[PDB]
Design a protein around this ligand. Structure first.
Ligand SMILES: CCCCCCCCCCCCCCCC(=O)O[C@H](COC(=O)CCCCCCCC[C@H](C)CCCCCCCC)COP(=O)(O)O
Ligand SMILES: CCCCCCCCCCCCCCCC(=O)O[C@H](COC(=O)CCCCCCCC[C@H](C)CCCCCCCC)COP(=O)(O)O
Ligand SMILES: C=C/C(C)=C/[C@@]1(C)SC(=O)C(CC)=C1O
Ligand SMILES: C=C/C(C)=C/[C@@]1(C)SC(=O)C(CC)=C1O
Ligand SMILES: [K+]
Ligand SMILES: [K+]
Lengths: 414, 414
């Protein structure tokens, strides 16, 4: 059976990354910030918080708002996720050296949680006020959830497929999994992949808050997200979008690109347990990890590092600790970046895959913030207090989503 | 290089199909109907048409509304596409003999155009009227576009992955493409796949009609949808959802299921041309067809039948005829089912895949309705007037979507 290690699949490398976060618009500054123990979570100053007296009054807005880079027409012709996709798509390509690739071998796979939903409600209000001729001729193509991926495909010229897998909070990792599949199956040699997501707003907070699993530690925003900690009280929103460029090792060599890491395998499963709670036993989630190992050609003892989904929900963290044990990876050093960056939903799995890549490139895992009281039921090696340094050779990035979706990505040091 | 024909991919068979359409809730009755020249397209009698004086006053509502089957609890706690998913998934599973499969080898892949969007505008109105605590605690899990796929995965017990590819009008076929990939790569032995979509409503009609591509032949509804006809004047909505059950031929034989057809190969590409117009040259669209043949182990000369996306827009049908030529498939017999069933957006490529399968099972292509004046730019063998019987062995189903997505599926007689 084919694996990366046994040459049954071609070698695929990560050759550029871009991300915008609550800490910085520059991924390399976000990364230094994380290492120095910086949090992007703050008191929400938005008017909408006082207008509605929201129970949740914390979150990380992007340091550098997407729309400060958007012109007059982009504001009127794209939904917010498409605007983010355009912004990141251009930054990534510039970071890659603006390569001239064969368009017929270039694919885009970009996940998102929802799509251009603000244009749904705008279109609804416009029609209710002034009838059907007040709806934009662009409303369909701004709203459709494949919109951000399609904007990036058009921007960069991708003709080997533009795909948008949606799996709620695992969408941004799932996208990279499908990009890797498309290359190893011979449909593409190069792919831009990742995840984008909307900003923090009143209605999203209201709707997630009614499920009662958001932190309300409003007095102390930077202490509120505590994945794996005994005193965790739910997740915190933190805005992000992130993309990476992956290509065959041969394609990278031929153009002189310097790889940051290798993308070795990907595992996708599903729980069939509950729509909005993960299976407590972590068995299908652990199988996604295992399947990424099988495809990579690795054993669980090879894994130095797991980048946890680690939302800081009580039931979420417990299930993931069980999954990591089921996969044999519970001696890896674990990071839960939502501790500092919060949860960006459809993008978050892409951001964390980027962080996994930087961990491998630089030999360092940032501290998990707020990890102050270990939880007996979670017996994991959670990195905390200061960075953990090592010559890491292999890591797995985990992401999970409402629906019972489990995605695991195996990366290696280049 | 592995193909189905050369045994490099495992054999994959279609063992059950279900669909609900404008003609019938029973796919076998829908099929008999199409063969008898029936149309599902009628005057819209909804009060919203006259309320808003909509330019488009025609379309095909389901013969049998999904909600005639829906418990009162479901009507509050699932979105419309989730209800459609649950209904179709239970029907499919019964049609299959309710098999006991290994859940850890069973995947679901179901596309849709948008998701539970009615719950977005419901949540918005509730919050505006009553504040943030009047939003449903189930709002998120009803809205998320992976919701329908996830309902089906929970309902049927799928633990090998639940996926929702979103590619607007090609989603339904793209879902079946990714299910075939998942089986041939060894991630699953059996999969439920296809597409669901919302109903014709006021805001959907306004937003699409403002793009200026819909038919407004309101005085003759059954004559409005005219794919490939010289006098075509745009597309017509017709509601549907459809699912099929695919599995390895070995798995089928083990349980004694008689196949309906073989699913031989799939190709996905993208245009990088325009967000809402297909590339005129048909080149990337023809490459998707060619890719499906390469993976099948077929040559264009083998192909007997093409089930065309055939929307009846002037530019869309012209581009598809060029793509069929690019692919070398322009000697095949062509059917354009939107002539009879109209356009079901995210569900349509799955519906048309099911029709392709029945064509191969029964050796007959239904007539393309309203095909009265050949267009010299098309120069295709369009089946029309009466059904055409023949010994069809191989067929390609086309679907394309806003964003420039091209999906082709290669099917074969069992
Ligand atoms: C990290 C946060 C993650 C967020 C959660 C993800 C949810 C998806 C986010 C959707 C995209 C939102 C885009 C907002 C653009 C923007 O900002 O529009 C403001 C003005 O507000 C609005 O129009 C708010 C309109 C909201 C649109 C409907 C959202 C409905 C959300 C659902 C009820 C709950 C969330 C469902 C998530 C399902 C999928 C993931 C599991 C500019 O203001 P002005 O400049 O005009 O003054
Ligand atoms: C032939 C298929 C047509 C496909 C069209 C696809 C459009 C997308 C699918 C939308 C799914 C909506 C489900 C409808 C539920 C239903 O019916 O609720 C009515 C009462 O009205 C409503 O609340 C309708 C309000 C709809 C609000 C959101 C619609 C947003 C539409 C966008 C602005 C334009 C379409 C975007 C498509 C992008 C994706 C594909 C390219 C019954 O009322 P009651 O009898 O129960 O009292
Ligand atoms: C099946 C449900 C799952 C996986 C739920 C998780 C663990 S995933 C996620 O991001 C969150 C917080 C938003 C959960 O509560
Ligand atoms: C890129 C745009 C494309 C492929 C557009 C097509 C041809 S596909 C489709 O179903 C329709 C009618 C709604 C189109 O107008
Ligand atoms: K992670
Ligand atoms: K078709």
């Amino acid at each position: 059976q084919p694996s990366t290690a046994n040459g049954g699949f071609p070698s695929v490398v990560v050759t550029a990354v871009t991300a915008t976060t609550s800490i910085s618009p520059d991924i390399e500054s976000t990364w230094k910030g994380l290492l120095a123990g910086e949090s992007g979570i703050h008191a929400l100053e938005d008017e909408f918080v006082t207008k509605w007296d929201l129970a949740v009054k914390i979150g990380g807005h992007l340091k550098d708002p997407v729309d400060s880079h958007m012109g007059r027409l982009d504001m009127r012709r794209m939904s917010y996720v498409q605007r983010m996709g355009k912004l990141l798509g251009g930054q990534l390509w510039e970071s890659a050296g603006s390569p001239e690739v064969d368009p017929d071998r270039f694919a885009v796979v970009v996940g998102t949680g929802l799509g251009g939903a603000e244009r749904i409600v705008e279109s609804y209000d416009l029609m209710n006020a002034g009838g059907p001729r007040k709806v934009s001729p662009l409303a369909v193509q701004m709203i459709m959830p494949n919109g951000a991926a399609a904007v990036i495909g058009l921007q960069l010229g991708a003709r080997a497929g533009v795909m948008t897998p949606v799996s709620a909070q695992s969408s941004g990792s799932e996208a990279i999994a499908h990009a890797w599949r498309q290359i190893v199956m011979g449909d593409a040699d190069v792919a831009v992949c990742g995840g984008v997501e909307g900003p923090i707003e009143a209605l999203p907070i209201a709707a997630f808050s009614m499920m009662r699993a958001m932190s309300t530690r409003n007095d102390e925003p930077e202490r509120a997200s505590r994945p794996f900690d005994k005193d965790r009280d739910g997740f915190v929103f933190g805005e992000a979008g992130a993309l990476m460029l992956i290509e065959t090792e041969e394609h990278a060599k031929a153009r002189g690109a310097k790889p940051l890491a290798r993308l070795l395998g990907a595992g996708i499963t599903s729980d069939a347990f509950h729509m909005v709670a993960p299976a407590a036993d972590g068995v299908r989630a652990g199988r996604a990890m295992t399947r990424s190992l099988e495809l990579a050609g690795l054993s669980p003892a090879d894994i130095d590092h797991v980048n946890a989904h680690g939302t800081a929900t009580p039931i979420g963290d417990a299930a993931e600790a069980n999954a990591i044990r089921v996969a044999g990876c519970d001696q890896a050093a674990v990071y839960a970046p939502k501790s500092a960056l919060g949860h960006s939903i459809g993008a978050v799995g892409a951001l964390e895959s980027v962080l996994t890549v930087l961990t491998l490139r630089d030999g360092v895992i940032p501290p998990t913030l707020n990890y102050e009281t270990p939880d007996p039921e979670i017996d994991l090696d959670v990195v905390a207090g200061e960075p953990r340094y090592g010559d890491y050779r292999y890591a797995v990035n985990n992401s999970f989503g409402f629906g019972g979706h489990n995605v695991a990505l195996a990366f290696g040091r280049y």
